[PDB]
Structure 1
Amino acid sequence: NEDLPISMENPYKEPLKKCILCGKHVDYKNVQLLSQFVSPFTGCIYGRHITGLCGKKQKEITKAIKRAQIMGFMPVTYKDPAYLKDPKVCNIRYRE
């Protein structure tokens, strides 16, 4: 009677993973953050597997980066060397 199970809202479910950048607000004016997701050597934009972002967030980043590049806030064929001594978000070999 009592000891049969009760259909119930999926407990022990750890809240879904975050982008890292989920509540944050990305501007083309902010070069720092944008620089963080570019390769230091080629100035090429990192992918999603590398960056580790939600799709919306990634798109926002990329568009912002593009805007920066055109509007003259950011470099294009490299990542600014003043912003190397910063937190590494991305997952990347080269150097070993």
Structure 2
Amino acid sequence: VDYKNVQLLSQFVSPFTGCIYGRHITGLCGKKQKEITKAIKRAQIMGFMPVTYKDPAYLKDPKVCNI
């Protein structure tokens, strides 16, 4: 899980608010949940990922979240 892979990290945020999903929604084991969380924050603060919304270019990727 890399902070530059914004496509993968956008598969774990809310399309309308940009909030990160929890493990009850994502289904990840807690360690990979922590990796995804830290990567998302790193990307957001380093100017790679939007924070208040999901980047529209990635709205049509496979839905891996149970929401």
Taking structure 2 as the reference length, the TM-score comes to: 0.98
The unaligned stretches of length 5 or more in structure 2 are none
Looking at structure 2, the residues matched to 86 and 30 of structure 1 have their Cα atoms a distance apart, in angstroms, of 13
Please tell me the root mean square deviation across aligned C-alpha atoms, in Å: 0.4
The 3-state SS of whatever aligns with 1:57 is helix
Paired residues, number: 67
Q: 1 or 2, which has the higher helix percentage? A: 2
Looking at structure 1, the residues matched to 46 and 32 of structure 2 have their Cα atoms a distance apart, in angstroms, of 21
Summarize deviations over 1:22-44 as a string: whole Å, max 9, x none.
xxxx0100000000000000000
The 3-state SS of whatever aligns with 1:28 is coil
Taking structure 1 as the reference length, the TM-score comes to: 0.69
Divergent runs of 4+, >6 A: none
Summarize deviations over 1:38-96 as a string: whole Å, max 9, x none.
0000000001100000010000000000000000000000010110111000011xxxx
The 3-state SS of whatever aligns with 1:62 is helix
The unaligned stretches of length 5 or more in structure 1 are 1-25
Which residue is equivalent to 2:45? 70
